[PDB]
Amino acid sequence: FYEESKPFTCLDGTATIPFDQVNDDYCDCKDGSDEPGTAACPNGSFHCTNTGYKPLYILSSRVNDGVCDCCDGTDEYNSGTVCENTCR
Amino acid sequence: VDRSNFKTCDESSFCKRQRSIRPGLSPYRALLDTLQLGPDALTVHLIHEVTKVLLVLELQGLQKNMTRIRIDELEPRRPRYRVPDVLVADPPTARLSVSGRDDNSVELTVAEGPYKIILTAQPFRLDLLEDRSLLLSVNARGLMAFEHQRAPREPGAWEETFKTHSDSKPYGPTSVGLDFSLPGMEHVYGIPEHADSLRLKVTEGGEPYRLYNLDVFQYELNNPMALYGSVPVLLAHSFHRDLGIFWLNAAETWVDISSNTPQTDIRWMSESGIIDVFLMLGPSVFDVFRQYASLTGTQALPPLFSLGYHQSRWNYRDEADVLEVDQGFDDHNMPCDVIWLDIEHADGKRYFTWDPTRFPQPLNMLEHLASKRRKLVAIVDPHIKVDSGYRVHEELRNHGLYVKTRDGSDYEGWCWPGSASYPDFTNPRMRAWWSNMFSFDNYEGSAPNLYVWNDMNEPSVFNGPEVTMLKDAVHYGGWEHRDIHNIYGLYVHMATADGLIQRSGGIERPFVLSRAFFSGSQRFGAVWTGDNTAEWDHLKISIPMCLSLALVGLSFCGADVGGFFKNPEPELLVRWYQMGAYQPFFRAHAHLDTGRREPWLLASQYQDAIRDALFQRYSLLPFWYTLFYQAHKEGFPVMRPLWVQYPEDMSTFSIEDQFMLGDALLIHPVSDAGAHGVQVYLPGQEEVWYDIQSYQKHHGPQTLYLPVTLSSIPVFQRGGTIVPRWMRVRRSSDCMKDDPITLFVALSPQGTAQGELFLDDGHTFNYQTRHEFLLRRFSFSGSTLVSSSADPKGHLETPIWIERVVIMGAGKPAAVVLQTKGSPESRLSFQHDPETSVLILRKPGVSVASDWSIHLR
Numbered sequence: 001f002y003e004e005s006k007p008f009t010c011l012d013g014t015a016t017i018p019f020d021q022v023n024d025d026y027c028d029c030k031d032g033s034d035e036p037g038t039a040a041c042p043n044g045s046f047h048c049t050n051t052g053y054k055p056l057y058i059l060s061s062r063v064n065d066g067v068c069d070c071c072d073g074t075d076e077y078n079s080g081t082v083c084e085n086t087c088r
Numbered sequence: 089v090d091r092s093n094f095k096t097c098d099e100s101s102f103c104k105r106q107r108s109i110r111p112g113l114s115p116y117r118a119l120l121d122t123l124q125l126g127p128d129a130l131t132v133h134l135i136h137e138v139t140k141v142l143l144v145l146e147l148q149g150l151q152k153n154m155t156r157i158r159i160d161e162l163e164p165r166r167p168r169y170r171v172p173d174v175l176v177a178d179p180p181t182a183r184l185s186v187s188g189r190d191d192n193s194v195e196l197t198v199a200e201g202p203y204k205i206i207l208t209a210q211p212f213r214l215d216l217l218e219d220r221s222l223l224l225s226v227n228a229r230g231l232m233a234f235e236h237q238r239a240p241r242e243p244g245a246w247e248e249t250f251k252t253h254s255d256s257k258p259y260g261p262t263s264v265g266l267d268f269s270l271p272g273m274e275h276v277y278g279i280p281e282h283a284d285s286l287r288l289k290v291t292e293g294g295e296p297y298r299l300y301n302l303d304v305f306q307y308e309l310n311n312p313m314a315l316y317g318s319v320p321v322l323l324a325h326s327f328h329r330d331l332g333i334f335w336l337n338a339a340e341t342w343v344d345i346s347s348n349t350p351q352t353d354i355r356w357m358s359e360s361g362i363i364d365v366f367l368m369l370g371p372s373v374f375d376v377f378r379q380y381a382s383l384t385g386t387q388a389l390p391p392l393f394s395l396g397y398h399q400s401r402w403n404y405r406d407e408a409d410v411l412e413v414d415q416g417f418d419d420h421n422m423p424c425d426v427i428w429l430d431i432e433h434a435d436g437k438r439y440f441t442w443d444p445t446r447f448p449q450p451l452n453m454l455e456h457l458a459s460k461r462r463k464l465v466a467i468v469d470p471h472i473k474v475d476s477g478y479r480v481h482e483e484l485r486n487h488g489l490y491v492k493t494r495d496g497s498d499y500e501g502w503c504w505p506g507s508a509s510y511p512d513f514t515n516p517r518m519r520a521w522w523s524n525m526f527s528f529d530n531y532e533g534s535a536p537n538l539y540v541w542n543d544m545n546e547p548s549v550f551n552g553p554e555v556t557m558l559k560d561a562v563h564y565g566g567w568e569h570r571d572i573h574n575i576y577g578l579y580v581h582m583a584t585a586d587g588l589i590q591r592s593g594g595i596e597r598p599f600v601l602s603r604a605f606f607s608g609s610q611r612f613g614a615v616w617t618g619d620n621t622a623e624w625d626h627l628k629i630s631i632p633m634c635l636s637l638a639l640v641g642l643s644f645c646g647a648d649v650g651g652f653f654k655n656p657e658p659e660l661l662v663r664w665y666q667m668g669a670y671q672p673f674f675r676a677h678a679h680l681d682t683g684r685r686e687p688w689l690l691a692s693q694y695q696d697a698i699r700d701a702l703f704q705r706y707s708l709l710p711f712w713y714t715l716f717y718q719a720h721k722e723g724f725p726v727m728r729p730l731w732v733q734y735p736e737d738m739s740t741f742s743i744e745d746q747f748m749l750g751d752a753l754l755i756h757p758v759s760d761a762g763a764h765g766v767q768v769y770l771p772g773q774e775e776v777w778y779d780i781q782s783y784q785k786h787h788g789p790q791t792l793y794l795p796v797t798l799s800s801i802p803v804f805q806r807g808g809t810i811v812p813r814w815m816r817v818r819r820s821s822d823c824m825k826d827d828p829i830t831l832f833v834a835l836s837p838q839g840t841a842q843g844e845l846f847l848d849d850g851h852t853f854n855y856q857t858r859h860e861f862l863l864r865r866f867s868f869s870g871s872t873l874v875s876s877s878a879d880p881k882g883h884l885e886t887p888i889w890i891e892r893v894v895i896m897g898a899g900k901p902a903a904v905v906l907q908t909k910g911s912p913e914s915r916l917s918f919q920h921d922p923e924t925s926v927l928i929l930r931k932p933g934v935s936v937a938s939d940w941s942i943h944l945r
């Protein structure tokens with residue numbers, strides 16, 4: 001009657017998790033692939049989209065650390081630090 | 089070390105006079121007809137049978153199982169020094185009652201018992217008992233010596249010379265001394281600072297231990313020479329009891345220790361002042377810690393960042409160098425809270441200034457560190473360049489706030505800025521002036537993320553006797569330097585800490601590192617063991633040195649990581665990072681002539697081991713913070729000898745290659761080049777220990793030979809404890825201080841555990857002025873983990889939540905249920921390792937401020 005969506009599988013195959021465990025601020029994959037948008041995994045990476053300029057990857061531990069790491073400031077979205085765009 | 093620069097006992101005329109008295113019948117006797125008994129004290133005249141000098145004994149029972157003995161002259165030519173500002177309060181007394189009396193003896197009962205004091209009149213003696221158990225005797229060997237003040241004007245009694253330095257000694261011989269006997273005690277500790285073993289040695293065939301704050305260049309190991317600080321507190325431990333002796337005297341003091349059914353005798357000998365001694369009768373070591381803390385206060389609660397990693401050297405070149413070092417930590421994923429600025433940062437060693445080439449824009453440099461959520465520490469010493477263009481000098485010269493010579497002129501000696509004068513920190517107006525100099529308007533270029541380091545505060549004087557101030561220099565109230573020496577550094581530390589509090593309007597907690605110290609210095613910040621050397625034996629001695637300090641209330645201790653002098657080989661530097669990462673004050677520091685040793689300059693294998701040690705420390709910050717809160721509230725040491733936790737285990741009494749942090753972690757850092765294993769003693773009958781890396785369980789009591797690699801830090805968690813960690817290691821502690829906690833529950837053989845957690849904003853006095861903090865108790869028994877409040881007065885608005893629970897020694901449950909008020913019952917997923925019996929509870933998601941329970945079904 002109603003077809004269900006498939007779960008998330010870690011990029012390293014270590015687990016299959018519901019999509020509510022993706023960016024849920026808890027590390028479920030040994031490669032950090034379930035948490036690209038948070039600080040939850042010790043070996044994850046956050047992508048600075050830097051719209052208009054060169055994109056950069058930073059350590060997950062620098063997401064919401066209160067420090068401006070991306071020139072576009074997208075790494076600081078719920079820390080209290082408001083980063084200015086400095087990509088130019 | 090150049091030993092010819094420092095006096096041995098024979099070269100200190102008062103030590104030579106005092107130590108020449110040997111055991112025998114004391115010439116002092118109490119005159120029982122002069123005895124007076126009040127509610128607070130007993131007073132009685134004592135007389136020297138030959139010279140007929142009259143003294144007054146003031147004997148007091150005190151609340152919390154202590155006795156105070158004060159002896160002074162009945163009719164002195166001039167007052168004797170009594171140590172100020174060390175005692176935090178006038179100790180509450182306990183009534184002494186006459187329960188026995190004859191023509192040569194008076195037996196006094198303390199309050200309603202069980203303690204008693206026997207005063208023998210001839211020869212003068214005091215015996216302290218609990219019921220029928222003799223705890224200690226006073227003057228049992230007849231070594232009491234009170235040199236009365238003679239008419240101001242044999243060899244060295246009056247004018248005295250040491251090398252080319254002349255002491256005019258206007259008041260002549262005035263030394264005081266007294267012996268104490270400890271029946272049943274064979275192990276004694278404390279009286280720092282000495283580069284020596286934790287369990288103090290007998291001094292019979294050599295020098296006594298010396299307490300005289302001194303700058304000792306290239307100090308050597310396993311000897312009793314006086315180092316930079318002095319805490320005149322000695323602890324005695326046996327299987328049956330703990331006792332403490334606190335000798336409240338600020339003058340040069342020598343301590344003799346002898347052994348003799350087993351018994352230890354202690355003799356104290358001080359240049360001047362009165363005899364003022366506190367006997368702390370325990371009975372447990374924790375009772376002694378509380379007793380001493382009631383007298384001199386507790387460890388100041390460090391701001392969280394100061395428990396992180398500190399990077400220093402003499403010197404970072406300039407702003408660019410500081411910013412490259414800052415960037416180096418982030419480019420190599422190595423955390424660091426503070427970068428330090430040694431004496432080359434100032435304008436020609438004029439303190440409170442900046443070199444205009446090297447540091448032209450200190451506020452901009454501080455803003456850059458603030459953007460990385462890091463701090464800076466600037467060195468400020470208590471010697472002021474003699475320079476009419478230097479505002480600090482002109483104000484202190486104009487207000488007469490310098491220490492003076494006898495002829496009334498301002499004392500001038502040689503130090504880092506060349507000709508320099510020494511502010512009189514014993515004067516309260518000088519301390520007020522100093523504190524106000526830290527205001528943001530006075531100390532130009534400073535900001536709230538700039539903290540302070542007080543060095544050379546013995547005080548160190550290059551052309552002075554023993555590299556210190558002349559004995560006959562004059563201080564506030566007309567006291568001589570000899571009277572006050574050992575509290576000069578403490579006053580520098582106190583006034584700097586107050587300056588950092590005041591500049592913030594009383595909101596921010598200070599951070600001040602001090603080289604010199606005394607009883608009560610724990611109230612003002614951190615201390616370190618001075619100029620150690622880049623050698624394996626100096627890495628090893630960091631444990632007994634900081635343990636000796638912990639026992640006498642100075643919990644915030646450390647030694648320079650890598651050694652101050654010389655260049656450590658990379659293996660030694662790695663092992664030092666591992667040792668330092670498990671010690672209270674954690675700073676890498678190095679002398680001017682050393683090669684650079686920022687941790688990313690080493691080969692990748694060494695960088696990785698250092699990063700691992702830094703990650704371990706940072707993750708344990710909630711545990712370190714909680715131990716420090718416990719030290720702040722109770723006076724209990726952070727870093728502990730194994731005998732403090734295992735008082736009846738006689739095999740632990742001299743252990744100094746291992747130590748405990750609180751009651752939960754046992755640390756045995758690797759401290760030999762090329763070691764492939766370590767011998768770890770895991771104590772406790774019916775106790776279990778978990779290797780924190782492998783989760784392997786070990787039953788006590790046993791000596792285990794554990795294999796190690798370069799990256800190994802032998803650490804064991806005790807069964808029965810719960811350790812909180814921040815598993816998300818970020819670049820500094822400010823970055824982590826709002827993050828979720830992981831609880832590490834190590835189950836005892838009875839399937840139980842407990843642990844506490846202190847949290848606040850990380851840096852203000854709001855925990856005390858507004859009760860803005862949390863103190864949680866985690867407890868496990870049966871099949872339930874519970875979080876409850878350990879102090880309901882504390883509330884805190886915080887986003888901190890419990891992200892994980894790691895349970896060591898647990899079987900696999902069928903279900904895991906979380907209950908917390910305000911939420912529906914939750915089912916948690918889990919992972920279990922049958923080989924290690926390690927259970928991981930996924931994402932509880934509960935606020936650390938809430939009560940909750942996790943049931944294993």
Ligand SMILES: *[C@@H]1O[C@H](CO)[C@@H](O[C@@H]2O[C@H](CO)[C@@H](O)[C@H](O)[C@H]2NC(C)=O)[C@H](O)[C@H]1NC(C)=O
Nearest residue numbers: 152153202218369370371372374375376378379
């Ligand atoms: C003061 O001393 C008393 C007497 O030693 C302490 O009370 C004893 O405490 C031990 C535990 O260490 C018990 O075994 C004894 O039964 C207690 N004896 C009595 C007579 O109560 C007491 O704890 C000490 N108090 C402080 C504040 O240090």
Ligand SMILES: O[C@H]1[C@H](O)[C@@H](O)CN2CC[C@H](O)[C@H]12
Nearest residue numbers: 402430431543603618619677
């Ligand atoms: O590096 C510090 C050292 O840590 C101190 O113990 C002694 N100081 C003397 C000069 C310089 O400030 C140096």
Ligand SMILES: [Ca+2]
Nearest residue numbers: 021026028034
């Ligand atoms: Ca997840």
Ligand SMILES: [Ca+2]
Nearest residue numbers: 062067069075
């Ligand atoms: Ca960031």
